[PDB]
Coordinates of C-alpha atoms and ligand atoms in Angstrom, one line a residue:
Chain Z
X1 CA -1.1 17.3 24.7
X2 CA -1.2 17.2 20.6
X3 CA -0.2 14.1 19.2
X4 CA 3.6 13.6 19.1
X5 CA 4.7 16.3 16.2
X6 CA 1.0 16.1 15.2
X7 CA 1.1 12.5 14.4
X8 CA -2.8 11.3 14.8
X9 CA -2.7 7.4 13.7
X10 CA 0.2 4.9 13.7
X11 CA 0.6 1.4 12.3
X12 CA 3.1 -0.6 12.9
X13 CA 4.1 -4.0 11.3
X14 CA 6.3 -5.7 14.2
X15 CA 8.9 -7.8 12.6
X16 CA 12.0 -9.2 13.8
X17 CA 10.7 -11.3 16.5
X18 CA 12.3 -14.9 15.0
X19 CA 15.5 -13.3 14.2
X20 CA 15.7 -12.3 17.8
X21 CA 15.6 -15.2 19.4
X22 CA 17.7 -16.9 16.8
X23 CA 20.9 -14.5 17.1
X24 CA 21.1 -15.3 20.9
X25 CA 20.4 -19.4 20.0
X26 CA 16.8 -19.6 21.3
X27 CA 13.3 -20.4 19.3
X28 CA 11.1 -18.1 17.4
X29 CA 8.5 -18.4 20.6
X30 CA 11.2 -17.2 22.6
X31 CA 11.2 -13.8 20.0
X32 CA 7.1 -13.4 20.2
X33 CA 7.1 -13.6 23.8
X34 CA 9.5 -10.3 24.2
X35 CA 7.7 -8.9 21.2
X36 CA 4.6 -8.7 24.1
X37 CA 7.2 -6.7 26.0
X38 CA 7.8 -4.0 23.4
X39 CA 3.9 -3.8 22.4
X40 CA 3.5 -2.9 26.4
X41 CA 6.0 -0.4 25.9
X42 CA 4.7 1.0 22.2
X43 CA 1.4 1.2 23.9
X44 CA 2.4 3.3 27.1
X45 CA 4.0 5.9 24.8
X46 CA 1.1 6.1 21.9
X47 CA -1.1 6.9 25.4
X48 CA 1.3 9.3 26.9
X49 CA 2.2 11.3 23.6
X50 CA -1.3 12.1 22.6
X51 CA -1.9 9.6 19.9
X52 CA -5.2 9.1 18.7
X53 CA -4.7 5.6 17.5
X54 CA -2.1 2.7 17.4
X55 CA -2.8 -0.4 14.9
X56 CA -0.7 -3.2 15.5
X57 CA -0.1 -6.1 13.2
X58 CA -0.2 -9.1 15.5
X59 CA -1.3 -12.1 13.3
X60 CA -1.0 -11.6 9.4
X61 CA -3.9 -13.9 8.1
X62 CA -1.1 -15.9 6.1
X63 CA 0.5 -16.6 9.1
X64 CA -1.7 -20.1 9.1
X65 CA 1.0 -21.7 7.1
X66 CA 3.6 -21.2 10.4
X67 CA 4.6 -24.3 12.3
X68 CA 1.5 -26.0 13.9
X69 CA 3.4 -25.4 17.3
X70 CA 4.7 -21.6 16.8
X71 CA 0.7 -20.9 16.0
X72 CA -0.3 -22.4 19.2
X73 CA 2.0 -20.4 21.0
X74 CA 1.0 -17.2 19.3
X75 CA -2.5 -18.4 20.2
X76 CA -1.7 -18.8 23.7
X77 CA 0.7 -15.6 24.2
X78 CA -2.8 -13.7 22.8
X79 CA -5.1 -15.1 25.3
X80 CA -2.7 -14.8 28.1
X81 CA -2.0 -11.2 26.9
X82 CA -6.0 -10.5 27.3
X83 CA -6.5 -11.6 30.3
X84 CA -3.0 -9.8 31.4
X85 CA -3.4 -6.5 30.3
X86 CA -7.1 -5.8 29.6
X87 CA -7.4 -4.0 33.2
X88 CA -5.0 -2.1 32.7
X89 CA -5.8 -0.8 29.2
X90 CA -9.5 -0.1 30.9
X91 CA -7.6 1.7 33.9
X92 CA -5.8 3.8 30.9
X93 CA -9.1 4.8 29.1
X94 CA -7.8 3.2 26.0
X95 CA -10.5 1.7 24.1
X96 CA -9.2 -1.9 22.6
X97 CA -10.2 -3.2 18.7
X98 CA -9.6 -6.4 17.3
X99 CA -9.8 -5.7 13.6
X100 CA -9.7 -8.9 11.5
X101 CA -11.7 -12.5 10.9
X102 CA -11.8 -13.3 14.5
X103 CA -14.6 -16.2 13.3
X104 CA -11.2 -18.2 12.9
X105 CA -10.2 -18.5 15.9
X106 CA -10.8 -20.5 19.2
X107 CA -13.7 -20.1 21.5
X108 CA -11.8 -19.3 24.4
X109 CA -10.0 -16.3 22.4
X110 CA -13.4 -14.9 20.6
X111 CA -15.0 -15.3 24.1
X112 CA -12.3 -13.1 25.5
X113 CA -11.7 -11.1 22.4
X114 CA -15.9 -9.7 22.7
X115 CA -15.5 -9.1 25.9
X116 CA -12.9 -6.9 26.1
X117 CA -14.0 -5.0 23.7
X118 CA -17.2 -4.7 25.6
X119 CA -15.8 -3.2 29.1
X120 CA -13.8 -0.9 26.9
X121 CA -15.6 0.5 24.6
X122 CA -16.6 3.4 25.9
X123 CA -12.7 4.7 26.7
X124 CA -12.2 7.6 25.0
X125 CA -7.9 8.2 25.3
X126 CA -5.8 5.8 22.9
X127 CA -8.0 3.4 20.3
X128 CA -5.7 0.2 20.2
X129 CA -6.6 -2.0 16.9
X130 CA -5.2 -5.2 17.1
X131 CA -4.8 -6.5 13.4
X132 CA -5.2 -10.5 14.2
X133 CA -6.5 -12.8 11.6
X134 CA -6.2 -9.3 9.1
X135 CA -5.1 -9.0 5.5
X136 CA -5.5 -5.8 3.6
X137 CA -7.2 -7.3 0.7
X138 CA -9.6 -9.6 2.8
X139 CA -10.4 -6.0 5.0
X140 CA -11.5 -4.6 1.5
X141 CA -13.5 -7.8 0.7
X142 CA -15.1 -7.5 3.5
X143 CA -16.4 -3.9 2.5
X144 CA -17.4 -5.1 -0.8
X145 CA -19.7 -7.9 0.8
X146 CA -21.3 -5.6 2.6
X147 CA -22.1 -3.3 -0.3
X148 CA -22.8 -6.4 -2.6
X149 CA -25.2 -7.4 -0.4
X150 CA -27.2 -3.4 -0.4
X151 CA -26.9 -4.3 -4.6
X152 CA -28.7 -7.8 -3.8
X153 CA -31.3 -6.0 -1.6
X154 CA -32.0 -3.8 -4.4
X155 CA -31.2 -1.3 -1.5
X156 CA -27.9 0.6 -4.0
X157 CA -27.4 0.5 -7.8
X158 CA -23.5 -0.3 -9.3
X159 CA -23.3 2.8 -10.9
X160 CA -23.5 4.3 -6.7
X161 CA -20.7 2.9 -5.5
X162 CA -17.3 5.0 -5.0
X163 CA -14.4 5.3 -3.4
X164 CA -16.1 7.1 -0.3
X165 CA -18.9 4.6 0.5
X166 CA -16.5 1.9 0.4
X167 CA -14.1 3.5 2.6
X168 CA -17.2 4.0 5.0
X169 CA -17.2 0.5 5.1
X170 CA -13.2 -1.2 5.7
X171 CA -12.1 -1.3 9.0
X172 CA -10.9 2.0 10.8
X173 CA -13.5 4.1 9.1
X174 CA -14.6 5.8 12.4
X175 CA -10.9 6.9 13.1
X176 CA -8.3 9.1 12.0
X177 CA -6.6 8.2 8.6
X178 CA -3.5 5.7 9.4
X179 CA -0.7 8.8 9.1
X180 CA 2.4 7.0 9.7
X181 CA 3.7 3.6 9.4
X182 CA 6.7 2.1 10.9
X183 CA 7.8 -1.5 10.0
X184 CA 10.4 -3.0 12.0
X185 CA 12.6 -6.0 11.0
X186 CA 14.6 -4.3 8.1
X187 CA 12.1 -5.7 5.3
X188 CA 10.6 -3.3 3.1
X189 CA 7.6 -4.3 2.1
X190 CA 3.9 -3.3 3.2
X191 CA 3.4 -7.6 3.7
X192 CA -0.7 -7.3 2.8
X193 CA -1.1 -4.9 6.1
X194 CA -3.8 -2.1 5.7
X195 CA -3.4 -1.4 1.9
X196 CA -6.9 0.8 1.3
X197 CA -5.7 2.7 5.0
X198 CA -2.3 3.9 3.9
X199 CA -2.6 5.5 0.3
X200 CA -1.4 8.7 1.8
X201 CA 0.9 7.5 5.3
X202 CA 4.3 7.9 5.5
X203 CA 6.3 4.8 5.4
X204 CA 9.4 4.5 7.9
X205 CA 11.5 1.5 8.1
X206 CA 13.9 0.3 10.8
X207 CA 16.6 -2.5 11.2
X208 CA 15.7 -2.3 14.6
X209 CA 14.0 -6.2 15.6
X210 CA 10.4 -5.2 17.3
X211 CA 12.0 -6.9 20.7
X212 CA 14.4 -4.4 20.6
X213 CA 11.8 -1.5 19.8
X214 CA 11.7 1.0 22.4
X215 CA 10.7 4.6 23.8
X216 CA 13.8 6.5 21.6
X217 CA 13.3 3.8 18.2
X218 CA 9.3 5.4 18.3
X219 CA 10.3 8.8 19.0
X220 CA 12.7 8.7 15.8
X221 CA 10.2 7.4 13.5
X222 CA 8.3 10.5 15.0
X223 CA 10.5 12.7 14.6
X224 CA 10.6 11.5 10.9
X225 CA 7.4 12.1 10.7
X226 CA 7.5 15.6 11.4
X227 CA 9.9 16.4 8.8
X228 CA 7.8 14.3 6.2
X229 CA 8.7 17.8 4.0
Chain I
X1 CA 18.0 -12.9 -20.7
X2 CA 16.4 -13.2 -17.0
X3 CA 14.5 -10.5 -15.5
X4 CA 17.5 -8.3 -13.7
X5 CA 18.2 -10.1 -10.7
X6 CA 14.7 -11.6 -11.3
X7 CA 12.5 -8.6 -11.2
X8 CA 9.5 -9.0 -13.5
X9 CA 7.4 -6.5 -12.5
X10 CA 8.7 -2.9 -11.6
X11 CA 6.5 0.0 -10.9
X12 CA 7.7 3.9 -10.3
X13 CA 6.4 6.9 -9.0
X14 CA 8.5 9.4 -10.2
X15 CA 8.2 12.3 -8.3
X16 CA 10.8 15.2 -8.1
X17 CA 10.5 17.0 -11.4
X18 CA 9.3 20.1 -9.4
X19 CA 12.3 20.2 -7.4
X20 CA 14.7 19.8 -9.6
X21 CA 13.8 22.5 -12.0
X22 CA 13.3 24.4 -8.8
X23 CA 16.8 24.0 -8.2
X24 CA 18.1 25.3 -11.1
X25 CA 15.5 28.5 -11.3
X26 CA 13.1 26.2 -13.6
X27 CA 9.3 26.4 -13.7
X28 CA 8.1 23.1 -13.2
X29 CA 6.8 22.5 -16.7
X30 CA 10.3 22.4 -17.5
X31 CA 11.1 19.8 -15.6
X32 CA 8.4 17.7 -16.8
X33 CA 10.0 17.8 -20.1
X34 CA 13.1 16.6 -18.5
X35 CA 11.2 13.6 -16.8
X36 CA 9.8 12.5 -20.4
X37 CA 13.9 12.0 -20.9
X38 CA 13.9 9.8 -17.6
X39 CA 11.2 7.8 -19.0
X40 CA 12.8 7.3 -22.2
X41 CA 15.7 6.0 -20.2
X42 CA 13.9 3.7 -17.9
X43 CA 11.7 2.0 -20.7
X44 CA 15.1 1.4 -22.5
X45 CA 16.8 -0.1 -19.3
X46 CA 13.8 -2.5 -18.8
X47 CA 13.2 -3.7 -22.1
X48 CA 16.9 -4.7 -22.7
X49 CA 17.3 -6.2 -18.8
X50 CA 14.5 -8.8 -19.5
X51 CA 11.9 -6.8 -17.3
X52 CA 7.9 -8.1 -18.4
X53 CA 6.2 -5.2 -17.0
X54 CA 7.5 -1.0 -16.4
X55 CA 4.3 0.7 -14.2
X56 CA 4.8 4.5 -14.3
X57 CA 2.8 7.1 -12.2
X58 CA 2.8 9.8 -14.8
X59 CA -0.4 11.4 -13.7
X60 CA -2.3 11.3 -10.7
X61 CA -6.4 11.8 -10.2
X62 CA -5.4 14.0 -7.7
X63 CA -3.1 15.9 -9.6
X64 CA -6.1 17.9 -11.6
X65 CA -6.0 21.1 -8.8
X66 CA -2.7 21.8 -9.9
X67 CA -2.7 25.4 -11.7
X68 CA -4.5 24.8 -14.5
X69 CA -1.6 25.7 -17.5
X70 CA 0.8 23.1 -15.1
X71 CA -2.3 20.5 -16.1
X72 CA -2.5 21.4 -19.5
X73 CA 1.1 21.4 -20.5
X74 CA 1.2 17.9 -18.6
X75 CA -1.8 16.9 -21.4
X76 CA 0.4 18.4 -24.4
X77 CA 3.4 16.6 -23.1
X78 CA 1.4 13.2 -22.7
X79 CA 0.3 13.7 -26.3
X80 CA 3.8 14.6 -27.2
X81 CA 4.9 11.4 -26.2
X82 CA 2.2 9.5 -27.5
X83 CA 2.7 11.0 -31.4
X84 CA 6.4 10.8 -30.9
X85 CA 7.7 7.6 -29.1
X86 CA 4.9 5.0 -30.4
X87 CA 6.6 3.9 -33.3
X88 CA 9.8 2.9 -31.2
X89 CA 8.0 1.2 -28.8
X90 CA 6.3 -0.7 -31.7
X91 CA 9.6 -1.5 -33.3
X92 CA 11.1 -2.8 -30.3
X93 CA 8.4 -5.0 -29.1
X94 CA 6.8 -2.8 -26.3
X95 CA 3.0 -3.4 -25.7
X96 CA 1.4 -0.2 -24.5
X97 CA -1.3 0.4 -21.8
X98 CA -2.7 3.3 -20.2
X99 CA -4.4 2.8 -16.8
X100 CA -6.9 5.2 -15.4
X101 CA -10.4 6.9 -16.4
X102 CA -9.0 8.0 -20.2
X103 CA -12.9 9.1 -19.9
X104 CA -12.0 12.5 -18.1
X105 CA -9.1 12.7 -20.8
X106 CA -9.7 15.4 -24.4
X107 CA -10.4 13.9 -27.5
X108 CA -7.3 14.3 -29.3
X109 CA -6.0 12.5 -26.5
X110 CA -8.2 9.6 -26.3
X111 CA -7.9 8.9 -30.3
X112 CA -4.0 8.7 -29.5
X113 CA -3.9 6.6 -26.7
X114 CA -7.0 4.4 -28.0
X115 CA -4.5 4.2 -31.7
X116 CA -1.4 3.5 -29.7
X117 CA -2.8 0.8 -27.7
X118 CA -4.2 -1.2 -30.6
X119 CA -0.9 -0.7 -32.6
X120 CA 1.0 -1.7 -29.9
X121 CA -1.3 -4.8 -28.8
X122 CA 0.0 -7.7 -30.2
X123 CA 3.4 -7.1 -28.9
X124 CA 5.1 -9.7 -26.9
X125 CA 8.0 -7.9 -25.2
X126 CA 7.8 -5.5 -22.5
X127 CA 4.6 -4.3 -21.4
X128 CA 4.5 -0.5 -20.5
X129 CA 1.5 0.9 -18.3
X130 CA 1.7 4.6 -18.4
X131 CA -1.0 5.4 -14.8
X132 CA -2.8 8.7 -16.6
X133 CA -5.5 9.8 -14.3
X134 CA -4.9 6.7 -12.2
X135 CA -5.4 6.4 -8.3
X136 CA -5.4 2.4 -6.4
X137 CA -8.7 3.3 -4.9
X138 CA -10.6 4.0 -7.5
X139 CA -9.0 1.1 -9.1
X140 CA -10.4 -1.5 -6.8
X141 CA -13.6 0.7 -6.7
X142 CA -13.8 -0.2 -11.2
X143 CA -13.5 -3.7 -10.5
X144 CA -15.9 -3.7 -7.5
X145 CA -18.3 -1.6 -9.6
X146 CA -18.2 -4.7 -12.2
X147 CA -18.8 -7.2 -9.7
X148 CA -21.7 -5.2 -8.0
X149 CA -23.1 -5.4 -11.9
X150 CA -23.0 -8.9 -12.1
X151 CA -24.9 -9.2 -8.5
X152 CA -27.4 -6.7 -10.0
X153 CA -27.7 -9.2 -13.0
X154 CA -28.8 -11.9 -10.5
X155 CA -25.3 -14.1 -11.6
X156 CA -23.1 -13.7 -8.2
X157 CA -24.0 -14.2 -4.5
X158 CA -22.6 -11.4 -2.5
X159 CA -21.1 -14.7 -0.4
X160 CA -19.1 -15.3 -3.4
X161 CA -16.9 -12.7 -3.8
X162 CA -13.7 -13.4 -2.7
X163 CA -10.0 -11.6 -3.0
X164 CA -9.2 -14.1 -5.8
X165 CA -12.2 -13.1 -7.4
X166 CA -12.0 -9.2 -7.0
X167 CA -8.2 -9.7 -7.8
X168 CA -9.3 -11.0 -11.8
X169 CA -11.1 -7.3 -11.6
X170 CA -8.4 -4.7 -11.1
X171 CA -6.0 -2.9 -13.4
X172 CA -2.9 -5.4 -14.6
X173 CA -4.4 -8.8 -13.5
X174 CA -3.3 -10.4 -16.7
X175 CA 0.6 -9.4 -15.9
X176 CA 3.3 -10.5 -13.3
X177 CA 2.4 -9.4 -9.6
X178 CA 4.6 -6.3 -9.2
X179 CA 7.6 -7.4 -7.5
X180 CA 9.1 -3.1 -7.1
X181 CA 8.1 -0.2 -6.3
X182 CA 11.2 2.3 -6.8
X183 CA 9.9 6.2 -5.5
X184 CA 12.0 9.1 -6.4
X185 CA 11.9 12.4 -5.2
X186 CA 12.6 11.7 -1.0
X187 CA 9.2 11.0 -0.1
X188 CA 8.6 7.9 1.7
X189 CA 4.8 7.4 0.8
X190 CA 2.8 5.5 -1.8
X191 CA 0.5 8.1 -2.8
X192 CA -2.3 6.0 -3.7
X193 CA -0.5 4.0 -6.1
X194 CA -1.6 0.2 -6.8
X195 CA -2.8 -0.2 -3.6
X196 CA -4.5 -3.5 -3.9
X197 CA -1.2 -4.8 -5.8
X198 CA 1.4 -4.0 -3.8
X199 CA 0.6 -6.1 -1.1
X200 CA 4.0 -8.4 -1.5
X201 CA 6.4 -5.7 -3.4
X202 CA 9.6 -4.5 -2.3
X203 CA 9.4 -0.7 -2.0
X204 CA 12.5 1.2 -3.1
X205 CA 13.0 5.2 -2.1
X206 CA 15.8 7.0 -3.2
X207 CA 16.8 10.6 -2.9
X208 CA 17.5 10.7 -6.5
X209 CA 14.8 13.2 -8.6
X210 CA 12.9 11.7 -11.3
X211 CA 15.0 13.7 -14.1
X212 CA 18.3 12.4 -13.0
X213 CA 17.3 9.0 -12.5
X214 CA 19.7 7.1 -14.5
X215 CA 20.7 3.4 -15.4
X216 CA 23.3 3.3 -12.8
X217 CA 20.2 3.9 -10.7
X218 CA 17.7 1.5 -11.7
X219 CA 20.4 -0.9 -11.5
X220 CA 20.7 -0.3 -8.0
X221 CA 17.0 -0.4 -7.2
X222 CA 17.6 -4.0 -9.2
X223 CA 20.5 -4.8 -6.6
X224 CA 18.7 -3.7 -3.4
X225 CA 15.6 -6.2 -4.8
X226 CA 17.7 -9.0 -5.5
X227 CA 19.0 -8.4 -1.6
X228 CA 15.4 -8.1 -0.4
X229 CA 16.5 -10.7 2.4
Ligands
LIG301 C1 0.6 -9.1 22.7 C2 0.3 -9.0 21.2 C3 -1.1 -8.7 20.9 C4 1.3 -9.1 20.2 C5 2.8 -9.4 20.4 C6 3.2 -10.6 19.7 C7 3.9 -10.3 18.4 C8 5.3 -9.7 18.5 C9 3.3 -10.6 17.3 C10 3.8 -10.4 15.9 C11 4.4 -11.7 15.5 C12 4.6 -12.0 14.1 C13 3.6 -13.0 13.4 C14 5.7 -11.4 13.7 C15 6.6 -11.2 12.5 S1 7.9 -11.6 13.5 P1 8.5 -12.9 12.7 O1 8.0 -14.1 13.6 O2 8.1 -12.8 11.2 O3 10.0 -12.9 12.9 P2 11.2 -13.0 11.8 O4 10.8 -12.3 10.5 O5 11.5 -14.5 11.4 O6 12.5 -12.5 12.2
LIG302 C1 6.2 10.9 -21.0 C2 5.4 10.5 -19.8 C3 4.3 9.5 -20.1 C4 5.7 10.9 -18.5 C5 6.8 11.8 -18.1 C6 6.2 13.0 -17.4 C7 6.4 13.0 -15.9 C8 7.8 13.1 -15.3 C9 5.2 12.8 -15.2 C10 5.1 12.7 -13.7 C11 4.8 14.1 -13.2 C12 4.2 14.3 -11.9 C13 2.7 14.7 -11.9 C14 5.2 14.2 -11.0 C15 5.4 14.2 -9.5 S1 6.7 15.3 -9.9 P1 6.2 16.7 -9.1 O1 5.6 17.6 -10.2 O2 5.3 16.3 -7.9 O3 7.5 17.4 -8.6 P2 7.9 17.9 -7.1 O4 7.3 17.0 -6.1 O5 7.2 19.3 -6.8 O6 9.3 18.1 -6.8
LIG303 MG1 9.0 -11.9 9.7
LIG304 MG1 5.8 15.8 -6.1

């Protein structure tokens, strides 16, 4: 089973959740909550349609500046969502990635964060990457540290450094290249979400809210793909 | 005169020249030609709409495997436009820039874009940035490069690099963040266009092909940003 209409790596940038809950009178939790729905659901059919990798962006690292309260939540809907769906995902062979500064967040949620990733590590079906604590330009950063530090060492000279040694070192590098990237949420913007990744994806936005993102919605922005001509 | 529905910075990739000499039984050279109209049209709109900063992808680092006479008559174009629209954008105002390694660029070249810069520099109006041999990564790679010097000089920690920091290093920091990107052509991709400073732009695709890009269109590009709700 080749990945849907040869689609290899998708991102997707889940917007829409607050509206959601506000056009039927209820809180912005209320949205996030069902937006755990439709990543159940996005998951299933990345696994089912031969995808190589889905990348979710799940908590934007300027997302600190939210309402003390709705952060919580978010907080809380991830650990419960660990502990919820981590058997199955090992059941599934999909191998689950937390790409982003997870050093921010509670003990609790790293403890369960590492050790997930541990029992699943050695799937080798679906690659889940959830972006949480992840900016594009902090995931570059990141890389540059690491090659600063080489310079320091005395270990790599400036004049060494290019654009494929640092793409060996930002997040994703052992994976397929990010083909295709679907924002829900009718915004068009890329919000600071895998900017190295995506110099050569193809972009599809959707009016669609994430909560109401389902099988059909995913196969359309496939199906777009396939006529990228 | 406020920025059109207050965009300050725009950038374009305009794509479609190919096409659209296609269309008509054209090689593509000649639509090339047609596109140096399109610019001529789209520096005009922006400098008399109160825009600070017009970004145009005129030639990609990847486009050098084109057929080699498709890459030279680009260059004779490029210097074309450099010998024959200078003095206008002088006399209205318009600072130029090129941005990309002008290093891989021929001589006659170099002189004209080195001479049109310094002509042009103490301008205060619009600032052009013609992207000639320009690709985001190996934009981010420059300014990494001069921060990996200063850590070889012993004056930065690798701890202290920082987005902010790496931000004051890539092409443009000392303009407006661009607020839109407007693609022509139908493709719905960035291309490797200002990845790093993107992050927060609108993105604008239209159908439209770069030679027939108008006012009329811009204007609408400036109408969908001003909705970006
Ligand atoms: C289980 C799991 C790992 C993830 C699912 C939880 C979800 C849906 C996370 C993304 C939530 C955020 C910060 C969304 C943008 S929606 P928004 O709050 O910006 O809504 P709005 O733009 O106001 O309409
Ligand atoms: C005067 C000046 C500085 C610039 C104007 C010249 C132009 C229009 C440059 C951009 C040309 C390229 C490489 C365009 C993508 S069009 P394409 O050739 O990819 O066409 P296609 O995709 O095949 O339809
Ligand atoms: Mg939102
Ligand atoms: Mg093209």
């Amino acid at each position: 089973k080749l990945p849907a209409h040869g689609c290899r790596h998708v991102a997707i940038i889940m917007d829409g959740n607050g509206r959601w809950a506000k056009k039927q009178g209820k809180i912005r939790a209320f949205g996030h909550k069902a937006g755990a729905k439709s990543v159940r659901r996005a998951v299933s059919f990345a696994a089912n349609n031969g995808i190589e990798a889905l990348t979710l962006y799940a908590f934007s690292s300027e997302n600190w500046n939210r309402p003390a309260q709705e952060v919580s939540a978010l907080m809380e809907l991830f650990v419960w969502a660990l502990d919820s769906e981590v058997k199955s995902l090992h059941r599934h062979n999909v191998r689950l990635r937390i790409i982003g500064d997870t050093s921010r967040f509670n003990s609790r949620l790293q403890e369960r964060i590492r050790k997930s990733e541990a029992l699943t590590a050695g799937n080798t079906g679906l690659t889940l990457n959830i972006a949480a604590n992840y900016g594009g330009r902090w995931d570059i950063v990141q890389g540059v540290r690491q090659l600063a530090e080489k310079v320091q060492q005395g270990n790599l000279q400036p004049d060494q450094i290019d654009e494929e040694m640092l793409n060996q070192h930002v997040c994703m590098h052992e994976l397929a290249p990010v083909d295709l990237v679907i924002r829900t949420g009718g915004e068009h913007r890329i919000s600071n979400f895998l900017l190295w990744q995506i110099a050569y994806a193809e972009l599809y936005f959707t009016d669609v809210l994430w909560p109401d993102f389902d099988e059909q919605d995913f196969e359309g922005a496939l199906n777009a793909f396939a006529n990228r001509e």
